Amino acid sequence: PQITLWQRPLVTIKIGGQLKEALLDTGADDTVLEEMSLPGRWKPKMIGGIGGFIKVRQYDQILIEICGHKAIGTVLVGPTPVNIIGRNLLTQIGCTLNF
Amino acid sequence: PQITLWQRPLVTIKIGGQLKEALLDTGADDTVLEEMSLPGRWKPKMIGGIGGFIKVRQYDQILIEICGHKAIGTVLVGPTPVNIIGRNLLTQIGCTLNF
Numbered sequence: 001p002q003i004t005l006w007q008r009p010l011v012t013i014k015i016g017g018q019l020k021e022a023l024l025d026t027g028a029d030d031t032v033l034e035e036m037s038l039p040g041r042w043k044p045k046m047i048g049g050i051g052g053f054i055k056v057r058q059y060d061q062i063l064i065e066i067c068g069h070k071a072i073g074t075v076l077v078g079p080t081p082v083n084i085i086g087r088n089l090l091t092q093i094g095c096t097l098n099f
Numbered sequence: 100p101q102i103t104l105w106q107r108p109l110v111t112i113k114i115g116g117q118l119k120e121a122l123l124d125t126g127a128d129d130t131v132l133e134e135m136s137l138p139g140r141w142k143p144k145m146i147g148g149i150g151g152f153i154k155v156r157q158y159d160q161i162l163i164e165i166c167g168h169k170a171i172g173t174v175l176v177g178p179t180p181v182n183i184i185g186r187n188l189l190t191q192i193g194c195t196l197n198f
């Protein structure tokens with residue numbers, strides 16, 4: 001698809017069998033999702049936002065679909081204003097910026 | 100151009116006679132740059148997300164050039180950890196997300 005930016009690039013993702021809205025964020029190195037239950041073990045991760053660094057939970061090798069495109073990768077969980085898809089999964093699905 | 104997302108999508112901008120480096124950020128509504136002088140009137144604004152909010156100065160109708168493309172728009176100025184180009188200017192250069 002081609003997505004313009006006149007509105008927020010919000011899309012439907014699927015994770016854990018659930019559909020959710022998420023923001024495609026080229027500014028984000030990593031994917032950060034609102035608190036949810038995920039399987040397996042998690043590790044600690046410090047991420048830097050505009051208002052400073054915060055602690056989130058890192059789950060690896062998780063299945064997630066983005067606009068129907070299937071991915072398996074790292075997902076962080078913590079207090080984000082909205083689910084964000086960052087470059088780790090944007091690259092997997094073959095996303096680029098174009099002008 | 101077609102900008103990969105393997106790396107942070109950083110470009111050179113020119114603003115207020117200054118040349119700066121800035122992150123193309125589809126997740127940001129508006130452009131925010133580290134402390135600098137800009138001409139004209141401004142109004143205070145709070146922006147935030149991860150790790151908090153910061154106070155910024157909002158300048159409207161500012162001329163900027165991004166990769167040779169000239170655009171006009173709102174520029175927020177404040178203690179952002181990294182210079183960010185937001186959707187409000189990404190649209191003007193015809194930037195889209197593609198996959």
Ligand SMILES: Nc1ccc(S(=O)(=O)N(CCNCCN(Cc2ccccc2)S(=O)(=O)c2ccc(N)cc2)Cc2ccccc2)cc1
Nearest residue numbers: 027028030047048049050082126127129146147148149181
């Ligand atoms: N006008 C304007 C208003 C707000 C913002 S923002 O606060 O940057 N923002 C846009 C998301 N940018 C992602 C990068 N992040 C930090 C940043 C800050 C400054 C420079 C580079 C990197 S981040 O903190 O959001 C982040 C950090 C790490 C990961 N993995 C994901 C997101 C708000 C938002 C956060 C999350 C969800 C929805 C919305 C920018 C401009």
Ligand SMILES: [Cl-]
Nearest residue numbers: 043044045055
């Ligand atoms: Cl911890």
Ligand SMILES: [Cl-]
Nearest residue numbers: 073074088089
């Ligand atoms: Cl990953």
